[PDB]
């Protein structure tokens, strides 16, 4: 253990660092457990990790943190999958620890620069979409044949949303085949764009059983002029996600990443991988948008939101950020807030996430276009109020009520 | 047969709970076991304890669940050799036997009871004692402790 | 809620069934929780799951099982990734449940037949390798080193008597060793060994890669060099990539070895996440000829897995962890691979526990080739003893001691 | 210097032989200066051996500070001090102190000195302010009674 736990080691600028939490088995000392984590996750003289710091979790019995450095050479350039097998491949199954959770990873600049990063990123995306000064809006269609589906898409986009999303569980099924969905959705988009003068799109799901099918779907979406596509990175895999991201850059297609199945590995607080780690891994692999979920543990949530948007984030344990992360000018990822949200939370969402975000909403009393209208109005009202110095956390009730005086659609929403 | 948990080397790293028992020896005999303090008064905070009687020898045992369960009436008996006491096979090593005098009455047929043998002190099965109509024993053996080794 | 919990429903032959274990939040009834799982995982009254049975977990408080049926129509033909988003996408994040674990899935024949299954399968794999009447042996090369020296270690071990040699699962392509050279030097080692011994030998070349294209390039080169088998990490790389590789393998005649790195992240804790037997079934449908299952030297659960991935038909038996009777409709099995903590002293048990249809991957011998020798002898001695009628769980000590006198290599191993 | 409940299975941690001679606060420095320093578990019987006999014996489960002490181990009963009887009385106390670390070197570390009546615990900085570079023992942990609720 004395070859792994080294209390007086200073990490190098090129080291990869990881922060783990663990609870050692009875009769196992914290230092020994820390040394073991470093050994299991690395060779076990320049190919071994080193545990450099161990400290108790304040307030938690039999619970410790361990900070482990890993040499740059242990990781394949440009590969998320290699980084993950090296760090989380089998350490979680180690017998002297009751439970193990990964809280954070510091990616050295030298490694960050070997990755593509987001196909476009935040600034490019706003320019491609020509949308500035506000959060973007969208929704998921609740229900259908491809034409009926296409009608729903048309109405929602026509009514004022920027994006409409496919249900994450619909790829291709006997009741609806993707090729038809793609054609009818594309038609709906084209009509709405022509009628409103804005840029609209739809998050077509191109998640597929094989890489060849994934490409066929993506290529068809490109042929139809679709500005954005969707993919489930955790279910499909990082090899597939990375592949699609490279395709997306070459073909100019924005990539939306859904986070289904994340709960399987990050929900419990004493085992598995914290979402912020996955969020960093994704920023390196690819994707322009990433679901973050809503807040309406806001501290931890905001922590990763900055980690995936900012260039340089200083360590701050109160926000769940263990290491200072320098992204070396790699573009950020728009967070997507979703689930449990409606116009009532619009004030909060605007103030909490700022402008660089997308808000996805789940029906409205008078159908879909009024639905879209109510959300569009509520958002613009909130943004303009913020720009005038109004306190959205308190005045939000009045901002929405006042907006409701000019918009019957919003009022119908606020009535409930 | 007899529950046997062996004390091991390196177990001193982090015991969260530990219990104390008076020590009696084979040479000391049955009289010492009667003499040992039965009630150890727990006025403990993280362990502070007082004994109804003053006792020269004390063994510190980890809070293994059988030992922890005893509470009052807990004693440890030192044996030079395991084979004589153990009805079964032995490793030629010193034996520590934890006995509860509270359950000394022989009710458990498979239960082992410390008794005064002609040679010295022995652990006897309850059924065997019932065959000889011995209603009472020194203590009922709860656990057998074996020494740390390489 | 009552539109999902239906206590008087009999599952159809075409339904996909799933068994979940859960612990409800205080205040929430078991039935309501079961209904909720069915709802979250499904929806149009033919597109909803139904919870048909709820029972307590014997011996545990606030711990229940729920059995949910899902209509065939909800699942994309041939796609593991669609099955998983549907079943495990969001139920794990559901608020009325403290914890949730997926224990089992019954795949209806109608769905099983839409999948490729293992490229070759157990019987074909034996015929291709021309190896019959026994478990196969291999090991992982240590140090886990130039391509030339690596190749020498591989040569010596294969030449010495092992059937397979494995790449460390964490080495894909690194500054100190690039895959293209590892592949050339290993292939040479194999070819010399085969020419010398007259047997068929392989090496589990790792073709895990950051992108699909790179994965194919690695696989294509392994084929060019005449390599009979390749390796891939199905969990890190994911199912889209795994399935793609499996299809390639079937078309090209290459066996596929699947490593289970990172499974601990998903299933180690007994009360949350996805049990490996589910992942094992999913993999059998996706692809893979070999699968790491790990050794036991829970036994009951382990035996459960092994039958589930090898037999044509498995009867439900809750004591072995099998919740539903599973008919594989003549799809071939996956050869299990035992590993972890094994050396010749465990050879008796390993042979009796797994039978002949298995691979044993061994860890350090005091004298490489003497290691291979010691294991080759120990295995043959154990298999012969079993056929004769000795009881390997009792006589194993004598079988090895006698065998140890035939070959001093084995004695040297037994002596430690 | 942790304060730990005598809790079994909370941090499960578990199994060891470790012993401290106990003193009462009322007894004063004389008892501390006389308690046996070397308590050696051995033979195979593992009955503990003390260089000298002591009246009161308590063990402190082998938590990390207790294990660290080795020689100089001592345990000090402390008893409270309620203005109002109805107001709940503070619990009885015990201090695990390293008499080997008598010298006052750490300002943060508490040290055992003598109060006008009984004994007292004083910060290292306070002791240095008072110009005492010496103390009886260095406190390595704090007490709290087994609470099942």
CSV table of C-alpha atoms in Angstrom, one decimal, chain B:
chain,number,residue,atom,x,y,z
B,1,UNK,CA,-21.2,-27.8,17.8
B,2,UNK,CA,-19.4,-24.9,19.6
B,3,UNK,CA,-19.4,-21.6,17.9
B,4,UNK,CA,-15.7,-20.7,17.3
B,5,UNK,CA,-14.6,-17.2,16.2
B,6,UNK,CA,-10.8,-16.8,16.0
B,7,UNK,CA,-9.0,-13.6,16.9
B,8,UNK,CA,-6.7,-12.6,14.1
B,9,UNK,CA,-3.5,-10.6,13.6
B,10,UNK,CA,-4.0,-7.0,12.4
B,11,UNK,CA,-7.5,-6.8,13.9
B,12,UNK,CA,-6.3,-3.8,15.9
B,13,UNK,CA,-6.7,-1.3,13.1
B,14,UNK,CA,-10.2,-0.2,13.7
B,15,UNK,CA,-12.5,-1.9,16.2
B,16,UNK,CA,-15.7,0.2,16.6
B,17,UNK,CA,-17.0,-1.6,19.6
B,18,UNK,CA,-15.3,-3.8,22.1
B,19,UNK,CA,-16.3,-5.6,25.4
B,20,UNK,CA,-14.5,-6.6,28.6
B,21,UNK,CA,-14.6,-10.0,30.4
B,22,UNK,CA,-12.9,-11.2,33.6
B,23,UNK,CA,-10.3,-13.9,33.1
B,24,UNK,CA,-10.3,-17.3,34.9
B,25,UNK,CA,-7.8,-20.1,34.2
B,26,UNK,CA,-7.8,-23.9,34.1
B,27,UNK,CA,-5.2,-23.9,36.9
B,28,UNK,CA,-7.3,-21.3,38.8
B,29,UNK,CA,-10.3,-23.7,38.6
B,30,UNK,CA,-14.0,-23.6,39.3
B,31,UNK,CA,-13.5,-21.4,42.4
B,32,UNK,CA,-12.2,-18.6,40.3
B,33,UNK,CA,-15.2,-18.7,38.0
B,34,UNK,CA,-17.5,-18.4,41.0
B,35,UNK,CA,-15.4,-15.6,42.3
B,36,UNK,CA,-15.4,-13.5,39.1
B,37,UNK,CA,-17.7,-10.4,39.1
B,38,UNK,CA,-20.9,-11.1,37.2
B,39,UNK,CA,-22.3,-7.7,36.9
B,40,UNK,CA,-20.3,-5.2,35.1
B,41,UNK,CA,-22.0,-1.9,35.5
B,42,UNK,CA,-22.2,0.1,32.3
B,43,UNK,CA,-22.1,3.8,33.2
B,44,UNK,CA,-20.3,4.0,30.0
B,45,UNK,CA,-19.9,6.9,27.7
B,46,UNK,CA,-17.6,5.4,25.1
B,47,UNK,CA,-17.1,2.5,27.5
B,48,UNK,CA,-16.5,3.6,31.1
B,49,UNK,CA,-17.1,0.7,33.4
B,50,UNK,CA,-17.0,-0.5,37.0
B,51,UNK,CA,-17.2,-4.0,38.4
B,52,UNK,CA,-19.1,-5.3,41.5
B,53,UNK,CA,-15.8,-7.0,42.6
B,54,UNK,CA,-12.2,-6.2,42.1
B,55,UNK,CA,-10.6,-8.6,39.5
B,56,UNK,CA,-6.9,-9.1,38.7
B,57,UNK,CA,-7.2,-10.4,35.1
B,58,UNK,CA,-9.2,-8.9,32.2
B,59,UNK,CA,-9.5,-9.8,28.6
B,60,UNK,CA,-10.5,-7.3,26.0
B,61,UNK,CA,-12.7,-8.9,23.4
B,62,UNK,CA,-14.2,-7.4,20.3
B,63,UNK,CA,-17.9,-6.9,20.3
B,64,UNK,CA,-18.6,-10.0,18.4
B,65,UNK,CA,-22.4,-10.5,18.5
B,66,UNK,CA,-22.4,-13.6,20.7
B,67,UNK,CA,-20.1,-12.0,23.2
B,68,UNK,CA,-22.0,-8.7,23.1
B,69,UNK,CA,-25.3,-10.5,23.8
B,70,UNK,CA,-24.2,-11.9,27.1
B,71,UNK,CA,-23.8,-8.7,29.1
B,72,UNK,CA,-23.9,-9.8,32.7
B,73,UNK,CA,-22.6,-13.2,33.6
B,74,UNK,CA,-19.8,-13.2,31.1
B,75,UNK,CA,-16.5,-14.8,31.8
B,76,UNK,CA,-13.4,-16.0,29.8
B,77,UNK,CA,-11.6,-19.2,30.7
B,78,UNK,CA,-8.0,-19.7,29.7
B,79,UNK,CA,-6.9,-23.2,28.7
B,80,UNK,CA,-3.2,-24.2,28.0
B,81,UNK,CA,-4.3,-26.8,25.4
B,82,UNK,CA,-7.3,-26.9,23.2
B,83,UNK,CA,-7.5,-30.7,22.8
B,84,UNK,CA,-8.4,-31.6,26.3
B,85,UNK,CA,-11.3,-29.2,26.5
B,86,UNK,CA,-12.6,-29.6,22.9
B,87,UNK,CA,-14.5,-32.8,22.3
B,88,UNK,CA,-13.3,-32.5,18.7
B,89,UNK,CA,-10.0,-32.0,17.0
B,90,UNK,CA,-7.5,-29.4,18.3
B,91,UNK,CA,-4.5,-27.4,17.0
B,92,UNK,CA,-2.3,-27.7,20.1
B,93,UNK,CA,-2.9,-24.0,21.0
B,94,UNK,CA,-4.1,-22.0,24.0
B,95,UNK,CA,-7.9,-21.8,24.2
B,96,UNK,CA,-10.1,-19.0,25.4
B,97,UNK,CA,-13.6,-20.0,26.3
B,98,UNK,CA,-16.4,-17.5,26.8
B,99,UNK,CA,-19.1,-18.7,29.3
B,100,UNK,CA,-22.5,-17.4,30.4
B,101,UNK,CA,-23.3,-18.5,34.0
B,102,UNK,CA,-26.8,-17.2,33.6
B,103,UNK,CA,-27.7,-20.1,31.3
B,104,UNK,CA,-25.8,-22.7,33.3
B,105,UNK,CA,-28.9,-24.8,33.6
B,106,UNK,CA,-28.7,-27.6,31.1
B,107,UNK,CA,-31.6,-27.1,28.7
B,108,UNK,CA,-29.9,-27.1,25.3
B,109,UNK,CA,-29.1,-30.6,24.2
B,110,UNK,CA,-26.6,-29.5,21.7
B,111,UNK,CA,-25.4,-26.6,23.9
B,112,UNK,CA,-22.0,-26.9,25.5
B,113,UNK,CA,-21.6,-26.4,29.2
B,114,UNK,CA,-18.4,-25.8,31.1
B,115,UNK,CA,-18.3,-28.3,34.0
B,116,UNK,CA,-15.8,-29.4,36.6
B,117,UNK,CA,-14.1,-32.5,35.3
B,118,UNK,CA,-12.0,-34.8,37.5
B,119,UNK,CA,-8.8,-33.7,35.6
B,120,UNK,CA,-9.9,-30.0,35.6
B,121,UNK,CA,-12.4,-28.0,33.5
B,122,UNK,CA,-14.2,-29.5,30.5
B,123,UNK,CA,-16.8,-28.4,27.9
B,124,UNK,CA,-19.7,-30.9,27.9
B,125,UNK,CA,-22.7,-31.4,25.6
B,126,UNK,CA,-26.0,-30.8,27.2
B,127,UNK,CA,-27.4,-34.2,26.2
B,128,UNK,CA,-24.5,-35.9,27.8
B,129,UNK,CA,-25.0,-34.0,31.0
B,130,UNK,CA,-28.7,-34.9,30.9
B,131,UNK,CA,-27.7,-38.6,30.5
B,132,UNK,CA,-25.9,-38.2,33.8
B,133,UNK,CA,-28.7,-36.1,35.2
B,134,UNK,CA,-26.6,-33.0,35.8
B,135,UNK,CA,-29.1,-30.2,36.0
B,136,UNK,CA,-26.5,-27.3,36.5
B,137,UNK,CA,-23.1,-26.3,35.1
B,138,UNK,CA,-20.5,-23.7,35.7
B,139,UNK,CA,-21.4,-21.7,32.6
B,140,UNK,CA,-22.9,-22.2,29.2
B,141,UNK,CA,-20.2,-21.8,26.6
B,142,UNK,CA,-21.2,-19.1,24.1
B,143,UNK,CA,-18.0,-18.7,22.1
B,144,UNK,CA,-14.6,-20.3,21.7
B,145,UNK,CA,-11.8,-17.9,20.8
B,146,UNK,CA,-8.7,-19.0,19.0
B,147,UNK,CA,-5.3,-17.2,19.0
B,148,UNK,CA,-3.8,-15.1,16.2
B,149,UNK,CA,-1.2,-16.9,14.1
B,150,UNK,CA,1.0,-16.8,11.0
